[PDB]
A paper describes a structure:
Viral determinants of virulence and transmissibility are still poorly understood, although lysine at position 627 of the polymerase subunit PB2 (PB2-627K) is now known to be important for avian influenza virus adaptation to mammals. Here, we report that a basic amino acid at position 591 of PB2 can compensate for the lack of PB2-627K and allows efficient replication of highly pathogenic H5N1 and pandemic H1N1 viruses in mammalian species. Our data indicated that a basic amino acid at PB2-591 can compensate for PB2-627K in mammalian adaptation; interestingly, these two residues are positioned near each other on the surface of PB2.
For comparison, we also present the crystal structure of the C-terminal portion of an H5N1 PB2 protein encoding PB2-627K (A/Vietnam/1203/04). The PB2 protein of the pandemic H1N1 virus shows an altered polar surface when compared to the avian H5N1 PB2-627K protein. The basic amino acid at position 591 fills a distinctive cleft found in the PB2 proteins of H5N1 viruses. In particular, the side chains of R591 and S590 in the structure of H1N1 PB2 occupy what would otherwise be the positively charged cleft in the H5N1 PB2. Our finding that PB2-591Q/627K (found in human viruses) and PB2-591R/627E (found in pandemic H1N1 viruses) adopt different conformations (i.e. a positively charged, ‘cleft’ vs. a positively-charged residue that fills the cleft and is located next to a negatively-charged patch) probably favors the former possibility, since it is less likely that they would both enhance interaction with the same host protein, but the positive charge introduced by either change could easily disrupt interaction with an inhibitory host protein.
Numbering used by the authors: 540 to 641, 644 to 739
Write the structure that this text describes.
Amino acid sequence: NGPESVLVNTYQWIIRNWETVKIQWSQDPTMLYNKMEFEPFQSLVPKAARGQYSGFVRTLFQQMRDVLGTFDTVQIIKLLPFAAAPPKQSRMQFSSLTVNVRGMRILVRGNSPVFNYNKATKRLTVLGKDAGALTEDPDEGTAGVESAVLRGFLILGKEDKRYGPALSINELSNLAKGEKANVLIGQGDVVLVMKRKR
């Protein structure tokens, strides 16, 4: 009882109700974001981060709506509870989002100890406990273009030496619209990104 249970139950709820969440996420996201079911999760989020995280995630979700062929079920499920605060817009980038449990990090890209989706089995494991199983979705984007990781950017694929040494996530704000660059996105992973034109 406490944080860990709120975390696990929140994601359990999303998975249980995925079909209606998916509909609302696409047709009326504001009302999805305003559901009472996300309030307990929001209390886990550091008070001073809630607005920042919401602005960030809401923009990442609109990028996914705006950039055809980049639908990512697991990414939507992972980031959704963070959209539930009144958004505070900024130019900050986040590689992880913190929930306070016992100060734990949910990685924005890929799996983490806290949030682990097992593709082979379709099971989501949160804090080592079962949150439920997904089903294969035909709407899933297969281009390897990731639209909901960086605010204002698309991840294109592997590092490409034509575009020079890798930048940190804090160093992307000088890039021109349409410009490409390599980025230390996390771990030791370097990826080619593009700054969006709109």
